Amino acid sequence: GEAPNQALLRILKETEFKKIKVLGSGAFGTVYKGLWIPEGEKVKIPVAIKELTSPKANKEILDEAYVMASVDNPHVCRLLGICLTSTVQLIMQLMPFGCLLDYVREHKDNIGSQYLLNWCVQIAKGMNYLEDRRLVHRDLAARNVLVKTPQHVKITDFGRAKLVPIKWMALESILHRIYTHQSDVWSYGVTVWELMTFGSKPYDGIPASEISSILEKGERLPQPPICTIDVYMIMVKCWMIDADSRPKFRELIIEFSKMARDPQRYLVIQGDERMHLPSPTDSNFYDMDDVVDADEYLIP
Ligand SMILES: COC1(CCN)CCN(c2nccc(Nc3cc4c(cn3)nc(C)n4C(C)C)n2)CC1
């Protein structure tokens, strides 16, 4: 019927990696910055460690791990392994610059049109990949795109992915709990809005109950100051009522790539082109001995 999922789930020993500090605490548990020093491999791999105990919640993290261990794409966050301790810990790639949402807020004054449009293209590539794998994310948002470097982002959070975040959802989903790749497009639209507004809250003030009807009336998020009509129209097409009228991810990749070739023609930003964000060709950008990025460390 469907193809066998031959992904390898890697079980890692607790003693093979060390927690360094905390990166975030929530209801789910807590995420640590850490290092993974596998076997006798002569490599340190920077990792994020997500740890939880109540039986019906352990199933949800293992569900996330299932999906996260099954993806392999440059614009999606893969699971490196799990560690079975009293708690259960997901080991993931360290994405040193955090979520894109906070990144746009904290670095607004150095974010030019090239970065924004390239981020849009990369998220669309990620999502298109998830579509090839017949996977529906169901929670795409700026908060769930992570920054490996300012020039490289990746989609995460498979805690809702299958084969509630109201202000990012398609209408069909809010009212009928229907979810498709095209419902992910809607959320893509909202995500891009967040980026083009440098991290503004969508429908800030409106309570989620009112949102369903607001959308029913034909209201949509406003045209961000920096957005040419070319870019805004793309957002708006992602918010059509007819799911099939919305763009496909494959087209979103194309449209944003064209615009990324002449960025200042599609986003208008004061001081654009004389802005500097950290690069792997900078000083102090990176024990340091034998550090290897997860993306360059392959197989057991
Ligand atoms: C807590 O789980 C998440 C959100 C679920 N709603 C989903 C999994 N996620 C994740 N996925 C893959 C890699 C990764 N690494 C990662 C996450 C980081 C990070 C560095 N690296 N710095 C910060 C501040 N954070 C997050 C807590 C947002 N983190 C971490 C956040």
From Swiss-Prot:
Residues with the Phosphotyrosine modification: Y286, Y297
Location of the Protein kinase domain: 17-267
Effect of K50 to A/M: Abolishes kinase activity
Lineage top rank: taxon: Eukaryota
Result when mutating G24C: Found in a lung cancer sample
Record-listed cross-link Glycyl lysine isopeptide (Lys-Gly) (interchain with G-Cter in ubiquitin), residues: K21, K42, K56, K59, K217, K248, K258
Binding site for ATP: L23, G24, S25, G26, A27, F28, G29, T30, V31, K50, M92, Q93, D157
Result for mutant: R265A: Reduced phosphorylation
Effect of P4A: Reduced phosphorylation
PTM section of the record: Phosphorylated on Tyr residues in response to EGF. Dephosphorylation by PTPRJ prevents endocytosis and stabilizes the receptor at the plasma membrane. Dephosphorylated by PTPN1 and PTPN2. Monoubiquitinated and polyubiquitinated upon EGF stimulation; which does not affect tyrosine kinase activity or signaling capacity but may play a role in lysosomal targeting. Polyubiquitin linkage is mainly through 'Lys-63', but linkage through 'Lys-48', 'Lys-11' and 'Lys-29' also occurs. Deubiquitination by OTUD7B prevents degradation. Ubiquitinated by RNF115 and RNF126. Ubiquitinated by ZNRF1 or CBL at different lysines in response to EGF stimulation; leading to recruitment of the ESCRT machinery and subsequent degradation in the lysosomes.
Record note on what altering D262A does: Strongly reduced phosphorylation
Active site: D139
Oligomeric form and interacting partners: Binding of the ligand triggers homo- and/or heterodimerization of the receptor triggering its autophosphorylation. Heterodimer with ERBB2. Forms a complex with CCDC88A/GIV (via SH2-like regions) and GNAI3 which leads to enhanced EGFR signaling and triggering of cell migration; binding to CCDC88A requires autophosphorylation of the EGFR C-terminal region, and ligand stimulation is required for recruitment of GNAI3 to the complex. Interacts with ERRFI1; inhibits dimerization of the kinase domain and autophosphorylation. Part of a complex with ERBB2 and either PIK3C2A or PIK3C2B.
Family the entry assigns: Belongs to the protein kinase superfamily. Tyr protein kinase family. EGF receptor subfamily.
UniProt name for this protein: Epidermal growth factor receptor
Whole sequence portion shown: 696 to 1019 of 1210
